[PDB]
Amino acid sequence: VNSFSGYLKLTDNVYIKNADIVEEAKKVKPTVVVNAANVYLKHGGGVAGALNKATNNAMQVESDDYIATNGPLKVGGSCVLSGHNLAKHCLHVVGPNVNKGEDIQLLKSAYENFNQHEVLLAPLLSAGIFGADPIHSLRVCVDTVRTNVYLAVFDKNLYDKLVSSFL
Ligand SMILES: O=C(O)C[C@H](NC(=O)c1ncnc2[nH]ccc12)c1ccccn1
Numbered sequence: 001v002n003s004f005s006g007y008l009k010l011t012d013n014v015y016i017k018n019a020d021i022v023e024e025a026k027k028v029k030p031t032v033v034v035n036a037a038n039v040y041l042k043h044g045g046g047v048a049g050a051l052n053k054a055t056n057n058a059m060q061v062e063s064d065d066y067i068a069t070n071g072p073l074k075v076g077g078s079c080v081l082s083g084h085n086l087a088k089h090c091l092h093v094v095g096p097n098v099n100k101g102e103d104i105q106l107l108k109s110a111y112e113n114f115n116q117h118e119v120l121l122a123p124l125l126s127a128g129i130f131g132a133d134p135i136h137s138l139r140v141c142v143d144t145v146r147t148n149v150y151l152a153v154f155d156k157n158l159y160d161k162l163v164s165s166f167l
Pocket residue numbers: 020021022036045046047050123124125126127128129130152153154155158
């Protein structure tokens with residue numbers, strides 16, 4: 001038993017809600033919140049900009065030190081950093097950004113990072129301003145992640161569309 005509330009059950013291990021991931025994180029304080037990052041960990045907009053703003057820019061400061069030491073992530077890759085005031089840990093996961101011309105096939109690799117964590121609060125990878133088909137992303141999530149994932153979808157119209165089209 002865990003502390004997530006009002007999530008619609010999609011499968012044996014995937015739950016979904018129409019909610020702001022920042023607000024869910026501040027309420028639940030999950031072990032792991034997933035950030036929809038880029039390879040430079042430049043947290044400008046979307047999930048990343050919103051999470052970082054909620055940490056008062058501490059996420060960005062930590063991320064800049066990470067990049068200075070380690071260099072950029074790979075598309076499809078991830079790193080574990082602090083969750084600051086939002087969670088114990090933040091798993092920064094890089095899904096392909098279609099608006100940058102990145103390989104959509106890399107979405108499955110991106111979701112595989114979730115399997116290293118027993119429970120996660122996450123956004124829908126590569127959706128929104130990342131430019132991929134969100135129905136496809138939810139499908140890849142359900143077909144790739146085996147650990148317990150709680151998906152927080154910001155856009156109300158998007159959430160309704162995702163639920164009504166889920167096979
Ligand atoms: O779920 C959605 O609608 C799409 C989702 N976006 C957000 O969660 C989001 N975007 C902007 N400002 C925000 N403030 C609080 C939440 C939030 C998303 C997923 C992957 C990549 C990019 N974007």
